[PDB]
Amino acid sequence: ENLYFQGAMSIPRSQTTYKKKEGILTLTEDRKFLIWTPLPATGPPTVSLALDNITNLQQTPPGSAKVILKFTERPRPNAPPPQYMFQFTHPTDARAEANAIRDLLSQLLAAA
Ligand SMILES: [Cl-]
Ligand SMILES: [Cl-]
Ligand SMILES: [Cs+]
Ligand SMILES: [Cs+]
Ligand SMILES: [Cs+]
Ligand SMILES: [Cs+]
Ligand SMILES: [Cs+]
């Protein structure tokens, strides 16, 4: 009792499109940021979103035409809120990949 545990499995990396480009959606090793990087995934991420600034996560329902996760960010101190949609594109595993990254995130987000 009172033991606190953190996640210790491999961080999921998901084949996803963002603004119609293909790339990889993952978290940083410290599990503090959601990141998306365009293929070939040599470079830095195009999207880097602090878990601390995510205010919502939504999904297309299972059996939808597309598998999509939608992240809403805290409005920046520069003034509707920023949103990011990632379409899961693995031919067979799209929904399982979305579930996995969703399940990780919602665990990290609820713990804070
Ligand atoms: Cl589905
Ligand atoms: Cl599957
Ligand atoms: Cs994977
Ligand atoms: Cs928060
Ligand atoms: Cs689908
Ligand atoms: Cs966006
Ligand atoms: Cs793909």
Give the CATH number of domain 14-111: 2.30.29.30
State the ligand closest to the CA atom of 97: 3
- Rounded CA-CA distance 100/37 in Å is 18
Going from the Cα of 68 to the center of ligand 1, the distance in angstroms, rounded, reads 9
Q: What is the dihedral of CA 23, 14, 61, 76, to 10 degrees?
A: -60
State the ligand closest to the CA atom of 70: 6
**What are the tokens at 53?**
């600034």
Going from the Cα of 14 to the center of ligand 7, the distance in angstroms, rounded, reads 9
- Rounded CA-CA distance 32/107 in Å is 13
Going from the Cα of 66 to the center of ligand 7, the distance in angstroms, rounded, reads 13
CB-based contacts of 50-58 (< 8 A; 24+ apart in sequence):
51/27, 51/105, 51/108, 51/109, 51/112, 52/112, 54/105, 54/109, 55/81, 57/102, 57/105, 57/106, 57/109
State the ligand closest to the CA atom of 15: 7
**What are the tokens at 66?**
């597309």
**What are the tokens at 13?**
């990396």
Q: To what resolution in angstroms was this structure determined?
A: 1.9
Going from the Cα of 68 to the center of ligand 5, the distance in angstroms, rounded, reads 9
DSSP-derived secondary structure letter, 80: -
CB 86 within 8 A of CB 16: yes
Residue 58 main-chain phi, psi, to 5 deg: -130, 160
Experimental method: X-ray
**What are the tokens at 37?**
């990087």
Provide the β-strand partners of residue 83: 72
CB 41 within 8 A of CB 24: yes
71 burial level (CB within 10 Å; 0-12, 13-18, 19+): buried
Going from the Cα of 17 to the center of ligand 5, the distance in angstroms, rounded, reads 14
Is residue 42 left, alpha or beta, with left meaning phi > 0 and alpha meaning psi from -120 to 50?
alpha
